[PDB]
Design an enzyme around this catalytic site. Structure first.
Site, PDB file in Angstrom:
ATOM      1  N   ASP A   1       0.253   8.451 -25.928  1.00 30.04           N
ATOM      2  CA  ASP A   1      -0.290   7.243 -25.367  1.00 30.04           C
ATOM      3  C   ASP A   1      -0.950   7.430 -24.015  1.00 30.04           C
ATOM      4  O   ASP A   1      -0.617   6.745 -23.103  1.00 30.04           O
ATOM      5  CB  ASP A   1       0.828   6.234 -25.290  1.00 30.04           C
ATOM      6  CG  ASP A   1       0.353   4.851 -24.942  1.00 30.04           C
ATOM      7  OD1 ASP A   1      -0.882   4.672 -24.794  1.00 30.04           O
ATOM      8  OD2 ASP A   1       1.246   3.912 -24.809  1.00 30.04           O
TER       9      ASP A   1
ATOM     10  N   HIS B   1       0.751  -1.217   0.000  1.00 26.07           N
ATOM     11  CA  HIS B   1       0.000   0.000   0.000  1.00 26.07           C
ATOM     12  C   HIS B   1       0.783   1.270   0.000  1.00 26.07           C
ATOM     13  O   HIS B   1       0.235   2.315   0.341  1.00 26.07           O
ATOM     14  CB  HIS B   1      -1.024   0.000   1.103  1.00 26.07           C
ATOM     15  CG  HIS B   1      -1.759  -1.305   1.217  1.00 26.07           C
ATOM     16  ND1 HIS B   1      -2.841  -1.635   0.419  1.00 26.07           N
ATOM     17  CD2 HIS B   1      -1.520  -2.408   1.986  1.00 26.07           C
ATOM     18  CE1 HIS B   1      -3.216  -2.871   0.699  1.00 26.07           C
ATOM     19  NE2 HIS B   1      -2.431  -3.369   1.653  1.00 26.07           N
TER      20      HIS B   1
ATOM     21  N   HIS C   1      -3.075   2.786 -25.148  1.00 31.70           N
ATOM     22  CA  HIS C   1      -3.057   1.477 -25.701  1.00 31.70           C
ATOM     23  C   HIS C   1      -3.585   0.430 -24.766  1.00 31.70           C
ATOM     24  O   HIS C   1      -3.319  -0.705 -24.973  1.00 31.70           O
ATOM     25  CB  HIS C   1      -1.673   1.123 -26.169  1.00 31.70           C
ATOM     26  CG  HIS C   1      -0.746   0.708 -25.092  1.00 31.70           C
ATOM     27  ND1 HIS C   1       0.188   1.572 -24.533  1.00 31.70           N
ATOM     28  CD2 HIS C   1      -0.468  -0.522 -24.588  1.00 31.70           C
ATOM     29  CE1 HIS C   1       1.001   0.879 -23.765  1.00 31.70           C
ATOM     30  NE2 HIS C   1       0.630  -0.404 -23.780  1.00 31.70           N
TER      31      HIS C   1
ATOM     32  N   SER D   1       2.204  -1.562 -18.576  1.00 28.61           N
ATOM     33  CA  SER D   1       1.742  -0.475 -19.383  1.00 28.61           C
ATOM     34  C   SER D   1       0.748   0.314 -18.599  1.00 28.61           C
ATOM     35  O   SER D   1      -0.068  -0.267 -17.901  1.00 28.61           O
ATOM     36  CB  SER D   1       1.098  -1.008 -20.643  1.00 28.61           C
ATOM     37  OG  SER D   1       2.023  -1.479 -21.644  1.00 28.61           O
TER      38      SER D   1
ATOM     39  N   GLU E   1      -7.145  -8.573   0.267  1.00 29.40           N
ATOM     40  CA  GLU E   1      -6.668  -7.239   0.544  1.00 29.40           C
ATOM     41  C   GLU E   1      -7.832  -6.420   1.083  1.00 29.40           C
ATOM     42  O   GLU E   1      -8.790  -6.164   0.393  1.00 29.40           O
ATOM     43  CB  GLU E   1      -6.125  -6.561  -0.731  1.00 29.40           C
ATOM     44  CG  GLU E   1      -4.883  -7.167  -1.269  1.00 29.40           C
ATOM     45  CD  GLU E   1      -3.647  -6.984  -0.363  1.00 29.40           C
ATOM     46  OE1 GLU E   1      -2.647  -7.724  -0.596  1.00 29.40           O
ATOM     47  OE2 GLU E   1      -3.653  -6.114   0.571  1.00 29.40           O
TER      48      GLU E   1
HETATM   49  N1  LIG Z   1      10.106  -0.510 -20.747  1.00 31.99           N
HETATM   50  C1  LIG Z   1       9.669  -1.719 -21.342  1.00 31.99           C
HETATM   51  N2  LIG Z   1      10.549  -2.817 -21.405  1.00 31.99           N
HETATM   52  C2  LIG Z   1       8.135  -1.916 -21.882  1.00 31.99           C
HETATM   53  C3  LIG Z   1       7.325  -0.816 -21.914  1.00 31.99           C
HETATM   54  C4  LIG Z   1       6.023  -0.883 -22.321  1.00 31.99           C
HETATM   55  C5  LIG Z   1       5.436  -2.004 -22.723  1.00 31.99           C
HETATM   56  N3  LIG Z   1       4.188  -1.803 -23.089  1.00 31.99           N
HETATM   57  C6  LIG Z   1       6.144  -3.270 -22.755  1.00 31.99           C
HETATM   58  C7  LIG Z   1       7.523  -3.219 -22.324  1.00 31.99           C
HETATM   59 CO   LIG Z   2      -2.206  -5.518   2.456  1.00 32.38          CO
END
Ligand SMILES: NC(=[NH2+])c1ccc(N)cc1
Ligand SMILES: [Co+2]
Length: 223
Positions: free
Chosen positions: A86, A10, A41, A177, A61
């Site tokens: 994005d 947390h 995305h 992401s 949780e």
């Molecule tokens: N920073 C990364 N290896 C990465 C970033 C975004 C993603 N969507 C997948 C891999």
């Molecule tokens: Co907890």
């Protein structure tokens, strides 16, 4: 997260998990009681956002809340140019109540400064190519615009920035992401993309440059 560690349970109350049929595919940041910020995305017709989590096991949780939403607003210019702008705001059906383990975070209005060290967290793949059981945390430093833009030319756009890419091989990765990148307690960016495999030396990850969409994020959340 690559080469990070279990976050302090947390410690990132703004963290939002986005799950599909039964698995996590993205993350978001609670930037308001009824709005979750995320990567364009990661758009869906309907999301099942989990707040106040630490382990994906919602019924393990306490202050956790698996809310629902369906109104998402991707940014107008998303993916034009390829991969740019994005970010996306998801409006939650029912506004949540900022609890002990669920609080919203504010978006940085100033832009990343090179060298500055920040943190990013998420349930994405680990250095072992495996998914973690709890939310991961790692530190990566902002990389300079020059190096970024040349390393990622011609895909680099002002709506993005680089962080990490150090020798320590610390970085985000698939499944993170839309995750948060906090700088001095502000939401500086969102996990967007980067070269694969992840954690390569000299190859930083790309994050949405939020400092650039404050007015849009506002005009949207509000009006
Ligand atoms: N920073 C990364 N290896 C990465 C970033 C975004 C993603 N969507 C997948 C891999
Ligand atoms: Co907890």
């Amino acid at each position: 997260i690559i080469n990070g560690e279990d976050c302090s349970p947390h410690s990132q109350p703004w963290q939002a998990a986005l799950v599909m049929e039964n698995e996590l595919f993205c993350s978001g940041v609670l930037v308001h009681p009824q709005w979750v910020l995320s990567a364009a995305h990661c758009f869906q017709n309907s999301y099942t956002i989990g707040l106040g989590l630490h382990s994906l096991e919602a019924d393990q949780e306490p202050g956790s809340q698996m809310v629902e939403a369906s109104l998402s607003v991707r940014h107008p210019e998303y993916n034009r140019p390829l991969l740019a702008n994005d970010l996306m705001l998801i409006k939650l059906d029912e506004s949540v109540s900022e609890s002990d383990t669920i609080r919203s975070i504010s978006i940085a209005s100033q832009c990343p400064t090179a060298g500055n060290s920040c943190l990013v967290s998420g349930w994405g793949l680990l250095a072992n190519g495996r998914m973690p059981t709890v939310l991961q945390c790692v530190n990566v430093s902002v990389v300079s615009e020059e190096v970024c833009s040349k390393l990622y030319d011609p895909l680099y756009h002002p709506s993005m920035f680089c962080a990490g890419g150090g020798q320590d091989q610390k970085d985000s990765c698939n499944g993170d992401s839309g995750g948060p990148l906090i700088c001095n307690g502000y939401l500086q960016g969102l996990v967007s993309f980067g070269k694969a495999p992840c954690g390569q030396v000299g190859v930083p990850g790309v994050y949405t440059n939020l400092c650039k969409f404050t007015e849009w994020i506002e005009k949207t959340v509000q009006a």
